RNA sequence: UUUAUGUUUU
RNA sequence: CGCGGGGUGGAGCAGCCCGGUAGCUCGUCGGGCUCAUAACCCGAAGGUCGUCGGUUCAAAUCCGGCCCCCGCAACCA
RNA sequence: CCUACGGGCAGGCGCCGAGGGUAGGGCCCGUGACUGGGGCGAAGUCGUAACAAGGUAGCUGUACCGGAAGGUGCGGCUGGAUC
RNA sequence: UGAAAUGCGCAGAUACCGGGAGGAACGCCGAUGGCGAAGGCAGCCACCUGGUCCACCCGUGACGCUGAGGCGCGAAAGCGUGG
RNA sequence: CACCUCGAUGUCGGCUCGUCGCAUCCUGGGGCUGAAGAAGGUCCCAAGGGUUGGGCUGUUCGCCCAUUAAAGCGGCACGCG
RNA sequence: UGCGAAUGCCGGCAUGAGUAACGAUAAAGAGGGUGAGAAUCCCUCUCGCCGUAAGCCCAAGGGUUCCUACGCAAUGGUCGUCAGCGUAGGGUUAGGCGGGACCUAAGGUGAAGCCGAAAGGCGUAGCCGAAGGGCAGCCGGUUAAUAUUCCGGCCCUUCCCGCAGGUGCGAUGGGGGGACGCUCUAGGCUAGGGGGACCGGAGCCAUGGACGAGCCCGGCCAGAAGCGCAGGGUGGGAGGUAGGCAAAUCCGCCUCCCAACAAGCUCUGCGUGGUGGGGAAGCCCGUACGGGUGACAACCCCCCGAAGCCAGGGAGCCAAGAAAAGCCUCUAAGCACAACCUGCGGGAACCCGUACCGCAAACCGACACAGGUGGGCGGGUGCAAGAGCACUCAGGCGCGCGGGAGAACCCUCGCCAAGGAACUCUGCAAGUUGGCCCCGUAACUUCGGGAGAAGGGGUGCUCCCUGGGGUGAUGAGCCCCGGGGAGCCGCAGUGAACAGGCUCUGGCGACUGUUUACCAAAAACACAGCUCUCUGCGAACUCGUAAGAGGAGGUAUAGGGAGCGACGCUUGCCCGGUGCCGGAAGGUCAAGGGGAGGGGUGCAAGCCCCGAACCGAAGCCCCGGUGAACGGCGGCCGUAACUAUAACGGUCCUAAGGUAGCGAAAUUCCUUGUCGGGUAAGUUCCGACCUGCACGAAAAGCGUAACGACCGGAGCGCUGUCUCGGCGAGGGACCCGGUGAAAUUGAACUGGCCGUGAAGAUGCGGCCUACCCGUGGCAGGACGAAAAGACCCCGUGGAGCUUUACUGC
RNA sequence: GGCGAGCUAGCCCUGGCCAGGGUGAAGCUGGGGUGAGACCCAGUGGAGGCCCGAACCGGUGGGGGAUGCAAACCCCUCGGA
RNA sequence: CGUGGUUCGUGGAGCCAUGGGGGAAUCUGGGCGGACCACCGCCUAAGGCUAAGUACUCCGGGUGACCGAUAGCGCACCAGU
């Protein structure tokens, strides 16, 4: 039956993407937090083109 | 008149529809003057500020002329009478001799191919607009300006109207469709006649769906809710109200007056 | 401007 | 037997708190008006206050028991 | 089978057919817990509507109301007494 | 009103004057009168329109009377929708 | 009453499957009778076996229909999820 | 700083156990091959399964899974030589397909501007934003693997430059246009399909017959200009002009004059078209596939025929159906040895995607998971139609453990003597019915319905006669609708598959619809419709501190709130209390005004404090109104010439004492009320009565046709529900081979009875019984497992909710 | 103080989808009817939160599954269409 | 007048700050010494800057009656994997 994950690449960037993080100060802080922990990825990896 | 239907389904049985014979050729409306696009949203920014709305037929906006003084002395011929989905009234398309085109909310009796005009000049026959000061006491008139130059506001609804009761100073006294007696500035335009298509009040939606078409989504009673949702929520086994009948937000909905007490407006009124 | 009523049969 | 109210001329109600005398409408009896009855008018009679005990100087009245009456309660199980 | 055999008969099949069965209707009669009013039956109860102007003139179609008669509104008739 | 009481009124009533709003009905004329098939119809004006009478003796030539059904009208109350 | 059980002893009725007690419903044996016979009443012995099918209600139970030799009462965590 | 317990924490290893399982009951068998090893890999043949798919093509999402070589430790539920797995190498080619150097939608963002303690929130233009608009590629061939991408053929787009011809050229600005709904549709076509006695073709004559107008296979695809058949779109002049925020010669409006017709001018679709290209069966090869030939293949007639195209076609309807650019036109600056337009020619054309999976072993579900996932194609025959159903093409599959056995038991199926609901809470379940044609059809009704009512008959095949319709001709064929007659066969003709059981009678809800994703689909919500109430427009109301926004680009026939809930007939009395509404008085009432009068301190001028009259809002008090506002709508006693009963009366209270209509009811406690009906028998059901514990009128009262997977009662039909079981089938269970879990588990050498014990003992006492160990089975016990009882209490634990609790905002 | 509407609810913009049967409203045309009408009858027409029924959307009853194929599935049946 | 700050929770409540209202003076001016008054004293508001002593440890170094791979940072090992 239809589950929770229904991946759509456009959603993912537009929602959790790098640029979307930088508008909201809440988001700029996530980046800050993630960067300070030294996460290898500050933002969900997405793809194609 | 009105359209009835043989009961060939339930609800086709009670259904009543508008009599469209009044409508001069129509089917497509008139671009140029109107339509614009209608942004069809049910909420303010983000959020629902009026309940039970949405859905219902896509609708083009005919942009209508509420300041007639715009062209004084220029006459115009009534080209058509059309169906406008955005109001109870019907709109008249009128061709000015300028070759300018405007829609007017169509008064009762105004018929295609008759000359119409606006100004202090202004014959007092139907479909014509004048400042109130020059309309003769006792004449029934529609599409009034509430303040001069601000545009028609009062009696625009299907088959509505206002009577001119008297005159005081630069103000004249109208009895509005509500029955309120109000002073309105003399310089305010208005247009002789009543609004027309007054049979409007007698159509019968007939069924759940017809109410949907009009963009009207089901309305649910507090009584049917839980107490989290409403003063009337809870208990069940149904219940009387158990308090003065209230709105979702808690104010009394039977009798409680609303109009702001101290209002500059307050000084120009006089009735119910 | 205070009244209602009169047992059955000859 | 849980909680509350009650028992007063023939009927229906007061009077009980706070003590001391029992009052109202109807009904009853006697007399009037009427040809007569009722209405109407003038007079009169009639209650130990459910009951036993207690309290007091005195108990319908304050107190306790028993007998009846009305109302409410009997939920989670 | 009989022949007087291009036949008749027995026999076979078929139509229709009394009726029987199944199904659904229409009319009439009887009957039924209960219920409605009606007629009739010397001396039971409540009132007094009508007959005299009936003590609110009566009656009337309708509507509403009321233990009951009745009452009241609207209009109508005189089959209403009274100067 | 029989007499009263309810009601209303010192929060300024009733009585009086001026202004406005709204609905209904049309005093005198008006008659014991007129019109209408009936129910019914009454301020004034205009439009549309029915019946009816009189004068003339001109035209049709019995084309008439009534009238089961049918159809239409039909006071008051009453009902539906809007006012 | 509040003793084991609230870090769980699933709770009515039915169904299936029984098993046991006897204070016996039937059948077997008896005494007494207000036991003529037949048929009962009443007590004693006796638990081997037997102890019906329906209508009503979730019902147990009752009531009712039709039968029967009889349509027994109980216990078994109101036996048995 | 010493561990045995904390359902402790981390780890390791046990127990159950060689136990359950190995993931759809579509299904397999054999021969050959490879190899150390083969049920499992390859190949052949036979068998079975999908086929509106389980085939094919898109889009998502995935991201090497693609092709090949070499591999088998692990992954694969077994095996593996195989693989979507390991290693390695290769593989994705575009001016025309998609997307971007185009447009705009919601929304987003946001010069101006507005607002906000900061962060930030708004917001006209503009900008971003697409599966919408716009825009030029068709057929075939090639690779192990890409192809509208390479190739071949045929065909087009834009940009730059240049010639020639033409024209007032010129835009982000004006105007046109783009440009739009739903249902139903016409004519002509195309895709697609069927038939052919015609054309082409390897071959074939068995097994009794057939050398035949036999069987079998195939009889196309694309294509500029021109042409033809369809169809779309469009009037042409002139004059006036004050409108289209400048200007227009354009558009608009007014008046004349021509056409009125597609005539014309166009633009599409289809046909034809130079030419190019394809091209079966079968047989021969080799697979791991593809290749030779069949061929110089043929390449045509007829029919059926779209939901597709002509497309902006038409008709009807109401709920009244995007934008912007491209495009055309108009003019403005400007510029007019510019420019733009048309034709020809040359040159110039960039970035990204392109493998493979894609109803699934490659996506979402921890899995090679019986689930989920949008668009297109989806052949043939028959059955009324159809995408339904059965079989079947193409194509794809037999689902990654097997072999046996033939027990109980389970699951899923088939049949059943007599009976036929006796089963049970209940006909739950399963039976019955079942498609089409015709006959036929009641109460009631809102006249539509109720209706598929009910209940019947027909249904195949054969020969003969025969009526219409479509194409063709006014004809033959071929399609399509039928009609009549005479026969044939079986148990049976919608011969298999798909395909209502029906009636009567209550309750609730009018109806279609909505809901507790994952125990409730309902009598609950919603619903048209009725009432009340608010709201004069910068409306009320809602969201927001605000700006702002919704309401609404609406205006009282509108909008918010509330109840009620189609419709029918109705909806009574009480305004004392509460709420709301009205009330220019009066009472109270805060700050403030006001200061009679008092106090501190100074020698004093003073400074500084209290502070009575009095004047001061709303609110409350107070007076009124209000019920489709919250709400409420009595008690005792008596009375009739039989008795009963009480139309009648008395009295007490109230704001008023429940009207109509209903009533043992979705309400009735007593209760299985009483009576009637149904039944052999009826705690339910139906009709009555009324003694209504404790109906009653918009938290509506009482009815109502129709409707209902709602809930109740009854009958017919028919049944394995049952008396009451039986047999049978298949998937399991069982035995063998392969792989191999789980909760649970103080340790165990773990019996019955009568006792005892913390009151229910394998574990204590007495006695009884009992050789050791298993396997298939049933569930009485281990107060069996699971979940630190949801009930209950307790905690001065918590949370949601209410209000005339307190206190605040 | 942040993160979430890739599930789910509502709404907004933009596209798409609904085999095939059945019933046969209005309106039209004609006929009758009338003073004129209402109206009646035919034929045509093709309306509907109309009917049957696939796709599609559901989730009614039952059976199965319950360390499942599945942390909601499967079969039969059933509602809309 | 309304609040904050101080130990000061309205308290006899000054001091410093200030949202609102009113609203001066320039040495004989002004604030303060805890309501107010007198006296006696202190200090000069409504402009600004100012090292050092102080805080911290991403970083380097030295020490340890600090751990020694279930310890010690989450990470001694290609771990914010
Ligand atoms: N026929 C009488 C009809 O009914 C009613 O009449 C009935 C009653 O009203 C009437 O009852 C009357 C009563 O009015 C009057 N006030 C008292 C009287 N005793 C009664 O009389 C009745 O009762 C007694 C029994 O005791 C009988 O014997 C007697 O025959 C009978 N009429 O008796 C009548 C029955 O016959 C109407 N009055 C009358 O208009 C109507 O027509
Ligand atoms: Mg779905
Ligand atoms: Mg997940
Ligand atoms: Mg996307
Ligand atoms: Mg999205
Ligand atoms: Mg890195
Ligand atoms: Mg916005
Ligand atoms: Mg936002
Ligand atoms: Mg309306
Ligand atoms: Mg509602
Ligand atoms: Mg609720
Ligand atoms: Mg909430
Ligand atoms: Mg609330
Ligand atoms: Mg409530
Ligand atoms: Mg209730
Ligand atoms: Mg009397
Ligand atoms: Mg007498
Ligand atoms: Mg008393
Ligand atoms: Mg007293
Ligand atoms: Mg005493
Ligand atoms: Mg409780
Ligand atoms: Mg016969
Ligand atoms: Mg009298
Ligand atoms: Mg009278
Ligand atoms: Mg009198
Ligand atoms: Mg009288
Ligand atoms: Mg009289
Ligand atoms: Mg009455
Ligand atoms: Mg009475
Ligand atoms: Mg008369
Ligand atoms: Mg007074
Ligand atoms: Mg006359
Ligand atoms: Mg008269
Ligand atoms: Mg006249
Ligand atoms: Mg003559
Ligand atoms: Mg003559
Ligand atoms: Mg006759
Ligand atoms: Mg009348
Ligand atoms: Mg009238
Ligand atoms: Mg205990
Ligand atoms: Mg335990
Ligand atoms: Mg014995
Ligand atoms: Mg005994
Ligand atoms: Mg015996
Ligand atoms: Mg004997
Ligand atoms: Mg039963
Ligand atoms: Mg019982
Ligand atoms: Mg017990
Ligand atoms: Mg038990
Ligand atoms: Mg049980
Ligand atoms: Mg240890
Ligand atoms: Mg220990
Ligand atoms: Mg441990
Ligand atoms: Mg085992
Ligand atoms: Mg086993
Ligand atoms: Mg096994
Ligand atoms: Mg071999
Ligand atoms: Mg070998
Ligand atoms: Mg094999
Ligand atoms: Mg992809
Ligand atoms: Mg890989
Ligand atoms: Mg591969
Ligand atoms: Mg391996
Ligand atoms: Mg291996
Ligand atoms: Mg393996
Ligand atoms: Mg596996
Ligand atoms: Mg090998
Ligand atoms: Mg590989
Ligand atoms: Mg190319
Ligand atoms: Mg492509
Ligand atoms: Mg492109
Ligand atoms: Mg470029
Ligand atoms: Mg753009
Ligand atoms: Mg913004
Ligand atoms: Mg900003
Ligand atoms: Mg696009
Ligand atoms: Mg596109
Ligand atoms: Mg393109
Ligand atoms: Mg092409
Ligand atoms: Mg190709
Ligand atoms: Mg279009
Ligand atoms: Mg067509
Ligand atoms: Mg062919
Ligand atoms: Mg042969
Ligand atoms: Mg031959
Ligand atoms: Mg072809
Ligand atoms: Mg000109
Ligand atoms: Mg201009
Ligand atoms: Mg279609
Ligand atoms: Mg089209
Ligand atoms: Mg069109
Ligand atoms: Mg643009
Ligand atoms: Mg130009
Ligand atoms: Mg110039
Ligand atoms: Mg490719
Ligand atoms: Mg593919
Ligand atoms: Mg699938
Ligand atoms: Mg698909
Ligand atoms: Mg799968
Ligand atoms: Mg695959
Ligand atoms: Mg698998
Ligand atoms: Mg998967
Ligand atoms: Mg799907
Ligand atoms: Mg069929
Ligand atoms: Mg198709
Ligand atoms: Mg199929
Ligand atoms: Mg095949
Ligand atoms: Mg398998
Ligand atoms: Mg058989
Ligand atoms: Mg049988
Ligand atoms: Mg039978
Ligand atoms: Mg039943
Ligand atoms: Mg049930
Ligand atoms: Mg069933
Ligand atoms: Mg018929
Ligand atoms: Mg019918
Ligand atoms: Mg039938
Ligand atoms: Mg048959
Ligand atoms: Mg046959
Ligand atoms: Mg023909
Ligand atoms: Mg035939
Ligand atoms: Mg069949
Ligand atoms: Mg069938
Ligand atoms: Mg059917
Ligand atoms: Mg419903
Ligand atoms: Mg429904
Ligand atoms: Mg649920
Ligand atoms: Mg839930
Ligand atoms: Mg369920
Ligand atoms: Mg349902
Ligand atoms: Mg359910
Ligand atoms: Mg907001
Ligand atoms: Mg606010
Ligand atoms: Mg605002
Ligand atoms: Mg706004
Ligand atoms: Mg707006
Ligand atoms: Mg309701
Ligand atoms: Mg009421
Ligand atoms: Mg009453
Ligand atoms: Mg009263
Ligand atoms: Mg009241
Ligand atoms: Mg009051
Ligand atoms: Mg009140
Ligand atoms: Mg005064
Ligand atoms: Mg006052
Ligand atoms: Mg003061
Ligand atoms: Mg002061
Ligand atoms: Mg006040
Ligand atoms: Mg007053
Ligand atoms: Mg009350
Ligand atoms: Mg008596
Ligand atoms: Mg008597
Ligand atoms: Mg009485
Ligand atoms: Mg009963
Ligand atoms: Mg009740
Ligand atoms: Mg029941
Ligand atoms: Mg009943
Ligand atoms: Mg009551
Ligand atoms: Mg009720
Ligand atoms: Mg009510
Ligand atoms: Mg209701
Ligand atoms: Mg009812
Ligand atoms: Mg239902
Ligand atoms: Mg069976
Ligand atoms: Mg078997
Ligand atoms: Mg003991
Ligand atoms: Mg024991
Ligand atoms: Mg011992
Ligand atoms: Mg053993
Ligand atoms: Mg065993
Ligand atoms: Mg056991
Ligand atoms: Mg346990
Ligand atoms: Mg516990
Ligand atoms: Mg507690
Ligand atoms: Mg607490
Ligand atoms: Mg927050
Ligand atoms: Mg969503
Ligand atoms: Mg929903
Ligand atoms: Mg489809
Ligand atoms: Mg005609
Ligand atoms: Mg439908
Ligand atoms: Mg259906
Ligand atoms: Mg189900
Ligand atoms: Mg179910
Ligand atoms: Mg189950
Ligand atoms: Mg089970
Ligand atoms: Mg403080
Ligand atoms: Mg304090
Ligand atoms: Mg202190
Ligand atoms: Mg202080
Ligand atoms: Mg000081
Ligand atoms: Mg200060
Ligand atoms: Mg200040
Ligand atoms: Mg100084
Ligand atoms: Mg100091
Ligand atoms: Mg001091
Ligand atoms: Mg002070
Ligand atoms: Mg100092
Ligand atoms: Mg360091
Ligand atoms: Mg060491
Ligand atoms: Mg380690
Ligand atoms: Mg470590
Ligand atoms: Mg170590
Ligand atoms: Mg560190
Ligand atoms: Mg660690
Ligand atoms: Mg590392």
UniProtKB/Swiss-Prot annotation, chain A:
GO molecular function: structural constituent of ribosome
Regions of compositional bias (Basic residues) in chain numbering: 29-49
Aminoacyl-tRNA synthetase among keywords: no
UniProt keyword annotation of Ubl conjugation present: no
GO BP, sorted A to Z: translation
A cellular component term, taken from the record's GO annotations: ribonucleoprotein complex
Keywords, alphabetical: Ribonucleoprotein, Ribosomal protein
Residue ranges of the region described as Disordered: 26-49
A Pfam family that the UniProt record links to this protein: Ribosomal_L34
Biological role: Found on the solvent side of the large subunit.
Note: The open reading frame (ORF) for this protein is entirely within the ORF for the RNase P protein (RnaP). The two start codons are separated by four nucleotides.
Family: Belongs to the bacterial ribosomal protein bL34 family.
HAMAP family listed in its UniProt record: Ribosomal_bL34
Subunit structure: Part of the 50S ribosomal subunit.
Full protein name: Large ribosomal subunit protein bL34
Curated annotation (Swiss-Prot), chain B:
UniProt entry tagged with the keyword Transmembrane: no
GO annotation (BP), single: cytoplasmic translation
Region (Disordered), start-end ranges: 222-272
Bias (Basic residues): 256-272
Any matching Pfam family: Ribosomal_L2
GO molecular function: rRNA binding; structural constituent of ribosome; transferase activity
Record's keyword terms, sorted: Ribonucleoprotein, Ribosomal protein, RNA-binding, rRNA-binding
Chain segments annotated as transmembrane: none
Extent of Basic and acidic residues compositional bias: 229-239
SMART domains noted in UniProt: Ribosomal_L2, Ribosomal_L2_C
A GO term from the CC aspect: large ribosomal subunit
Subunit composition and interactions: Part of the 50S ribosomal subunit. Forms a bridge to the 30S subunit in the 70S ribosome, contacting the 16S rRNA. May also make transient contacts with protein S6 during translation in the 70S ribosome.
Annotated family: Belongs to the universal ribosomal protein uL2 family.
Stated role: One of the primary rRNA binding proteins. Required for association of the 30S and 50S subunits to form the 70S ribosome, for tRNA binding and peptide bond formation. It has been suggested to have peptidyltransferase activity; this is somewhat controversial. Makes several contacts with the 16S rRNA (forming bridge B7b) in the 70S ribosome.
Name of the protein: Large ribosomal subunit protein uL2
Lineage, highest ranks first: Bacteria, Thermotogati, Deinococcota, Deinococci, Thermales
